[PDB]
Amino acid sequence: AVSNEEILQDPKNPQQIVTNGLGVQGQRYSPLDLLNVNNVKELRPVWAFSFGGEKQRGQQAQPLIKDGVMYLTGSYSRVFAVDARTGKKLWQYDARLPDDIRPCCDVINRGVALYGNLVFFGTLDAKLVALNKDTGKVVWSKKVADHKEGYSISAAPMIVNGKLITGVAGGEFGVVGKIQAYNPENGELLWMRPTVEGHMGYVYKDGKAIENGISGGEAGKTWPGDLWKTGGAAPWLGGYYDPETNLILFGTGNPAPWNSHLRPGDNLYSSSRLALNPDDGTIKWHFQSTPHDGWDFDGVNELISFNYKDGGKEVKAAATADRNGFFYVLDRTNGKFIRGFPFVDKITWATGLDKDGRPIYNDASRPGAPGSEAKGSSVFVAPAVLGAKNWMPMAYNKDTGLFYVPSNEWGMDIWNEGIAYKKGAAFLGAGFTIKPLNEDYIGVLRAIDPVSGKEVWRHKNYAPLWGGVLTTKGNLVFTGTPEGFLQAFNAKTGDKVWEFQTGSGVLGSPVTWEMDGEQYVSVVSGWGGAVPLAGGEVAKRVKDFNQGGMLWTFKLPKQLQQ
Numbered sequence: 001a002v003s004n005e006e007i008l009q010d011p012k013n014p015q016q017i018v019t020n021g022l023g024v025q026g027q028r029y030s031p032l033d034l035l036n037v038n039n040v041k042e043l044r045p046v047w048a049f050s051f052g053g054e055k056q057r058g059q060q061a062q063p064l065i066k067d068g069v070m071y072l073t074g075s076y077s078r079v080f081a082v083d084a085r086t087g088k089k090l091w092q093y094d095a096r097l098p099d100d101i102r103p104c105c106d107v108i109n110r111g112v113a114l115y116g117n118l119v120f121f122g123t124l125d126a127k128l129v130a131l132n133k134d135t136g137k138v139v140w141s142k143k144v145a146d147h148k149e150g151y152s153i154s155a156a157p158m159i160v161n162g163k164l165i166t167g168v169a170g171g172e173f174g175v176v177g178k179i180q181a182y183n184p185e186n187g188e189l190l191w192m193r194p195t196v197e198g199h200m201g202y203v204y205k206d207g208k209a210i211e212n213g214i215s216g217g218e219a220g221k222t223w224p225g226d227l228w229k230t231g232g233a234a235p236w237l238g239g240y241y242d243p244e245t246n247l248i249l250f251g252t253g254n255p256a257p258w259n260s261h262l263r264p265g266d267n268l269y270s271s272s273r274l275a276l277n278p279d280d281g282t283i284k285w286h287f288q289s290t291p292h293d294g295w296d297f298d299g300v301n302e303l304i305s306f307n308y309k310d311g312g313k314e315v316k317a318a319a320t321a322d323r324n325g326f327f328y329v330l331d332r333t334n335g336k337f338i339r340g341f342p343f344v345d346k347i348t349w350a351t352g353l354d355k356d357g358r359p360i361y362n363d364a365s366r367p368g369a370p371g372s373e374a375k376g377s378s379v380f381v382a383p384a385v386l387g388a389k390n391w392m393p394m395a396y397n398k399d400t401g402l403f404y405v406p407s408n409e410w411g412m413d414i415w416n417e418g419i420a421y422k423k424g425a426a427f428l429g430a431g432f433t434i435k436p437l438n439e440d441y442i443g444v445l446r447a448i449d450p451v452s453g454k455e456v457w458r459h460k461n462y463a464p465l466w467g468g469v470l471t472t473k474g475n476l477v478f479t480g481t482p483e484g485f486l487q488a489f490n491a492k493t494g495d496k497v498w499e500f501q502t503g504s505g506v507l508g509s510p511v512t513w514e515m516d517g518e519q520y521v522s523v524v525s526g527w528g529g530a531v532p533l534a535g536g537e538v539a540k541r542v543k544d545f546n547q548g549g550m551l552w553t554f555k556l557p558k559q560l561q562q
């Protein structure tokens with residue numbers, strides 16, 4: 001019972017959230033102001049729900065809420081439907097995964113989409129699955145790509161104009177990134193768009209594939225040889241949608257392999273934001289945040305539409321906080337660069353950006369080719385591969401006009417080595433050691449003014465930040481930490497105003513809605529993601545955190561709101 005019109009209405013209906021992002025554009029702003037800075041001290045848990053199964057590791061989903069039911073996912077490709085008032089399980093679906101799934105960076109899933117009477121998610125073996133919302137039974141299932149080649153799906157899918165859209169993951173395995181659209185009611189494929197230059201895109205009619213143009217025009221323009229056959233650029237975080245331009249906004253992963261000396265050229269459309277026509281999957285514009293990447297600076301980070309006035313004229317902009325340390329503001333009608341500036345305190349790989357937004361490179365920060373030796377010499381670089389910001393989404397507060405960015409301060413030693421492609425095997429050609437830049441913190445929650453280009457406030461955390469952000473009309477910003485807290489801040493000043501220890505690192509993006517006249521806040525807990533794969537000093541810092549897997553629901557009691 002979710003229509004396309006209801007999706008387009010988020011977040012205006014207080015009782016429900018039917019989108020990843022609290023609105024198709026991904027602003028993660030709630031207009032609810034029952035809960036505010038003056039009464040958040042009265043927020044407390046009302047129930048929890050354990051995912052069970054002796055299956056923990058990272059838990060990244062944002063729940064959706066419709067008709068008093070919460071729909072969410074867990075690690076190892078599981079879906080849960082849970083009563084929003086009581087916490088009682090309605091049903092659970094556990095995908096049967098093969099033993100040879102190939103995630104790069106933990107067995108995570110970032111959420112469902114809803115349409116009609118169905119619940120949709122992508123699996124770690126690169127299937128797209130539709131479940132009946134009331135029973136959890138499978139209605140249809142389609143293979144998006146071959147998991148034996150290194151494809152997986154970790155992102156939440158999205159609905160645009162009645163079409164169900166998913167990307168894929170796997171750049172660390174040399175997959176060919178692609179975005180594809182499906183009929184939500186029966187899983188019929190509608191179109192497919194590669195994100196690597198040289199591959200053909202298609203529309204589908206009557207079960208036939210109809211050519212619909214080569215991505216990037218022709219193979220070999222910004223890649224050498226046949227490197228584009230394994231080029232990566234996986235659109236692994238999903239994307240968002242702008243109704244004003246009718247464009248899907250999707251970022252793309254790093255080019256493969258990590259050894260950039262094997263692939264001279266800009267390597268399109270890796271490490272880029274793409275704007276696509278949802279009718280047919282054609283790319284209307286692109287902006288490449290890291291041409292010829294050498295640092296696994298994936299360009300997937302969300303591109304969030306927002307509007308502002310400049311010298312009397314209305315600007316249709318979009319902002320993104322990139323892995324590479326720059327915060328970018330683009331004209332979302334045509335992809336043109338407006339401004340770009342660091343949102344972390346140290347960037348070594350570039351000294352700035354040119355007038356089109358292309359980096360001005362510092363070539364001493366690119367690791368050298370191995371040449372005669374087994375490994376090249378290491379170079380120190382900031383940010384580290386894990387980025388100034390990774391998967392975890394920022395949020396936009398319409399009242400303050402600021403973005404709230406979960407960032408990290410770390411560099412690395414990185415080196416290169418030879419690497420041959422082998423189907424199903426890692427395709428790196430580089431190694432690294434992460435080196436935090438500061439002894440007493442890594443994570444920094446930052447409030448950024450995208451019009452002036454200035455940081456307004458910052459809040460430091462000992463561990464890295466790895467969780468999505470929520471902001472609300474009550475002058476609140478919420479986000480989780482690996483220490484296990486859900487925390488709230490004053491959106492104007494950054495002062496901490498509330499927190500709760502959930503018992504496991506919090507990665508899920510928080511969500512808020514209203515039921516029976518009371519405001520609820522919920523988040524998914526359970527530590528994991530890429531940070532536990534880092535050795536060295538980062539591992540020492542996070543060693544005492546424990547795994548989990550739990551949905552937490554909090555409420556402000558009606559009698560305490562005033």
Ligand SMILES: O=C(O)c1cc(C(=O)O)c2c(n1)C(=O)C(=O)c1cc(C(=O)O)[nH]c1-2
Nearest residue numbers: 105154169170171172234236253254529530
């Ligand atoms: O290039 C890719 O296809 C791809 C996929 C993913 C993924 O699917 O989650 C990550 C990465 N790259 C990546 O580079 C990275 O640092 C990363 C961290 C995480 C995580 O959930 O903590 N996922 C991924």
Ligand SMILES: [Ca+2]
Nearest residue numbers: 161278279280
């Ligand atoms: Ca369309």
Ligand SMILES: [Pr+3]
Nearest residue numbers: 171253254298
């Ligand atoms: Pr990557």
